[PDB]
Design a protein around this ligand. Structure first.
Ligand SMILES: *CC(=O)N1Cc2ccccc2[C@@H](c2cccc(C#N)c2)C1
Ligand SMILES: *CC(=O)N1Cc2ccccc2[C@@H](c2cccc(C#N)c2)C1
Lengths: 304, 304
């Protein structure tokens, strides 16, 4: 037992990280098969970022201007193209460490691991959730651009995120591996406010089930509620509205614990209305929303 | 910017994980060079664990009784010996994926990453701290025994922990890689209570410096304190006494932020005495103690 914010083992992703330099700009790239994926703003200087015309800036770049270094070995660039906000640099060598992989565009509320990198070198790994406002609350300094987010299903890496930007609020924005931003964000040095960050209700409920399984039970009560009654409380506390889809996905946790989903909702309602009165749940003093129902089952069953 | 509980990239450790089976018991082993390290209780059944005589049980085991499987390839066992609470199984093949490594016995208050494993397969990675009472608050199910804790200094893995046990309180106990338990714990199915878990004061202060650097500043006040005045407050709130050594290690963070260590102590004193009044610090509603001063500098500077 015990419950932790666990990231996926990052080995399969570390073997894909490379450094990409263009002019005076260096960031991270993802090497899969004979293609290196990186943010298109690698072709900009901070001077260019104010209002870049990516198509015009790219015309001045040739294959030989993109320096791609895998650890300490230089890759030969034989092609380049722009797909949305990412550059795809065709190299003459397929990565021998390419895992079985997929590119997936995740939904808000879903979780993933980020392998933060600097100059093609991995520094750490942490678990994230794509916020309902399509931002992530990460840890990214200059040079971290091109670091990726991913999930792992046994031997298959599903890449879902590439880091591009930090909002003036300190929150993070980026794209899926096809270069399409999550949310309304553009790759430009301009003030772009993120919307209201709501709490992922289905994840908080999943985490309350993780809590009961691991022994933290003080918050269980004698009450029940309805989806509509619960959503009136969710709306006041800027929680996402809970749907029957959410209830269905909580099914296995409800079955394992014997606590009906609407009974767990009544516990969450009371925790929202009364606070935690100085107590903790799984070592946390706030309601944790960055564990999906899938993460709870995976962690509580020992999936490798 | 942004601040996260970040674990080290686990790739170098995943390449060392193997499965070790003895009789009907299966757990994880660590393959480095031509040696596989695992908990000695691999030779026990749950029946044996009540009061095992490890030396007597081991006499009935030959090299051929220890089945070591690296992913899907079987390793040939050419020797075995017991060192404290670990078994060292000499194999006929050196691990080709052995990183540059060291075995280190960490101090309480120090942090490390755990690669939780089941049947020699990695499931996830998370950041831990060795508690002042020599327990860790991990996430370990049956079959997780033999999972290791480590730190990474560029290319060198310093293994510090091997998981052996779960206390009836749900907290975790284990050994360094020489098989010596941290704390007073023995490898036996017996009630062993852990001592008072105190809060790692130097880590909370380091995390308050991480908070100021990243923008969370509400807790800064107009006060100062002394080491002795602060320790009177630390003792009441079961915080570790702060020493000049702790102040010295906080030196770089004090220099970077311009906030004198004793001024930060006065902020911590007020947070201990008044609570957080419904506010958060780096997305947390409690005072975080599982970031050392080294982790804060490493994360805030981008060390790979
Ligand atoms: C995340 C990162 O490494 N960087 C550094 C960098 C290097 C060259 C050009 C831009 C950047 C910024 C950046 C500024 C403004 C907008 C974006 C986007 N998209 C990125 C971030
Ligand atoms: C952590 C783990 O995998 N296991 C399973 C197991 C398998 C065989 C023998 C013992 C165990 C237990 C266990 C019980 C009691 C004490 C210890 C220790 N040390 C380990 C845990």
């Amino acid at each position: 037992s015990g419950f932790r914010k666990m990231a996926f083992p990052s080995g399969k992703v570390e073997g894909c990280m490379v450094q990409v330099t263009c002019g005076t700009t260096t960031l991270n790239g993802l090497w899969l098969d004979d293609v290196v994926y990186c943010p298109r703003h690698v072709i900009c200087t901070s001077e260019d970022m104010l209002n870049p015309n990516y198509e015009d800036l790219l015309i001045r770049k040739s294959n030989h201007n993109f320096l791609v270094q895998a650890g300490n070995v230089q890759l030969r660039v034989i092609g380049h193209s722009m797909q949305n906000c990412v550059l795809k640099l065709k190299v003459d060598t397929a990565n021998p460490k390419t895992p079985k992989y997929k590119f997936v565009r995740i939904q808000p509320g879903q979780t993933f691991s980020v392998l933060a990198c600097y100059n093609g070198s991995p520094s750490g790994v942490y678990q994230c959730a794509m916020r309902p406002n399509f931002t992530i609350k990460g840890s990214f300094l200059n040079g971290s651009c091109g670091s990726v987010g991913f999930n792992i299903d046994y031997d298959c890496v599903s890449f879902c995120y590439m880091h591009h930007m930090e909002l003036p609020t300190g929150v993070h924005a980026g794209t899926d591996l096809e270069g399409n931003f999550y949310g309304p964000f553009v790759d430009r040095q301009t003030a772009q406010a993120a919307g209201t960050d709501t709490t992922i209700t289905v994840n908080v409920l999943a985490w309350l089930y993780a809590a009961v399984i691991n022994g933290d039970r003080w918050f269980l009560n004698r009450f029940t509620t309805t989806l509509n009654d619960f959503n009136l409380v969710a709306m006041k506390y800027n929680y996402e509205p809970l749907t029957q889809d959410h209830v269905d996905i909580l099914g296995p946790l409800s079955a394992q614990t014997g606590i009906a989903v609407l009974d767990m909702c009544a516990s969450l309602k009371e925790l929202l209305q009364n606070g935690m009165n100085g107590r903790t749940i799984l070592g946390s003093a706030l309601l944790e929303d960055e564990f999906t129902p899938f993460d709870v089952v995976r962690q509580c069953s020992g999936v490798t």
